[PDB]
């Protein structure tokens, strides 16, 4: 606090870690489904939340949520994952991107279609 | 780009008359001006603070036919310019070419004026201008070219304008169909129902 003290030893900037460190400051990343499963939510939620453990192109083994009703994913299925946590599931930091490499868009969606990789119905 | 949807809808949502129709027949006859648009129109929820500011901004934008990026740019310009910010913004909006033609009266609506400008009916200083956002300068005469001078719509529009209250800051000749933009309008010349402090606050959120 004393100016002399500051001169001797200045103030450390508070290094804020990223909450999506497997991306490595990339907006998306490609990966291979190591394992596809359902899991129980955190404390006041009830569900079987769909999630895939994915080995990324840059070495990292993360787990990624799979949003939307129903999915075609299985083991060895290349999907795009993005940034975003599911809160009520512990340790899930990434969503899969629907509508890329090997992940389908949600069926019969008419709203938020861009969010669920759904093409314009005729 | 342009707003292409229902116009009386815009007026109803805002509350005021935005002059989005020619005004031969009154808007109370054209729509339920008191009731808001949609299933839940009669219900009127109480607007907090953000909402009121947003509504004011929407009103002004709708009245003139400026999209958000353009409006924001205009605001930036007003702030940059010396003097009062709201007044500057209003002056710029008025300066717009479509607005000037409408004020002169070579079009029933702002839409009509813009269409004419687009379709190359309007000369600024004897030079065909095509842009509705074209800033007119002081002492600039702007006239209908003869090809658009034969339009019955144009003559009808002139009559309608004659019905309306004529603006002091321009001087327009109906037979010659040319008007001289003598000076940038004063705030006293513009409408009192338009509030600028709300708009300024909104763009200073």
């Amino acid at each position: 606090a004393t100016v002399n003290q500051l001169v001797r030893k200045p103030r450390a900037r508070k290094v804020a870690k990223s909450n999506v460190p497997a991306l490595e400051a990339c907006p998306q990343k490609r990966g291979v489904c190591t394992r596809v499963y359902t899991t129980t939510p955190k404390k006041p939620n009830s569900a079987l939340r769909k999630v895939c453990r994915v080995r990324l192109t840059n070495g990292f083994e993360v787990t990624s949520y799979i949003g939307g009703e129903g999915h075609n994913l299985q083991e060895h299925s290349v999907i795009l994952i993005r940034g975003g946590r599911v809160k009520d599931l512990p340790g899930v930091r990434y969503h899969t991107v629907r509508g890329a490499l090997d992940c389908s868009g949600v069926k019969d969606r008419k709203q938020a279609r861009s969010k669920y990789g759904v093409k314009r119905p005729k | 780009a342009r707003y292409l949807g229902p116009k009386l809808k815009l007026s109803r949502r805002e509350g005021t008359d935005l002059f989005l129709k020619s005004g031969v027949r009154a808007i109370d006859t054209k729509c339920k001006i008191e009731q808001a648009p949609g299933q839940h129109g009669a219900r009127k929820p109480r607007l907090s603070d953000y909402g009121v500011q947003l509504r004011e901004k929407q009103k002004v934008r709708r009245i003139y036919g400026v999209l958000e990026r353009q409006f924001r740019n205009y605001y930036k310009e007003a702030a940059r310019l010396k003097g009062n910010t709201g007044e500057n913004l209003l002056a710029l909006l008025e300066g717009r070419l479509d607005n000037v033609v409408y004020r002169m009266g070579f079009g029933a609506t702002r839409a009509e004026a813009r269409q004419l400008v687009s379709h190359k009916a309007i000369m600024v200083n004897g030079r065909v201008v095509n842009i509705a956002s074209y800033q007119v300068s002081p002492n600039d005469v702007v006239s209908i070219r003869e090809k658009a001078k034969k339009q019955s719509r144009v003559k009808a529009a002139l009559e309608l304008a004659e019905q309306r209250e004529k603006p002091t800051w321009l001087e327009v000749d109906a037979g010659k169909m040319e008007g001289t933009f003598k000076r940038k309008p004063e705030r006293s010349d513009l409408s009192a129902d338009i509030n600028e402090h709300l708009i300024v606050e909104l763009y200073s959120k």
């Binding site: 100016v3 002399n4 500051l6 001169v7 200045p10 | -």
Partner: protein, 80 residues
Amino acid sequence: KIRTLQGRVVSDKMEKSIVVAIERFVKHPIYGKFIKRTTKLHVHDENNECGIGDVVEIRECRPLSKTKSWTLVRVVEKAV
């Protein structure tokens, strides 16, 4: 009149050469405290007239050794 600097002789062991601290009383960029910073310079002195701890005025010159590009002009305040 020539550009010249004053400084204390921190050592004079190496023959024909002295090291001359040139303390300058600079202000700190951020905190505003005035901190004493030092600039040691190896200075050439012929005849080895200077002692350790003295005060000596020096000027810049063509390099006389790997580290020695300053020469002394006059010794002053040579008390012990």
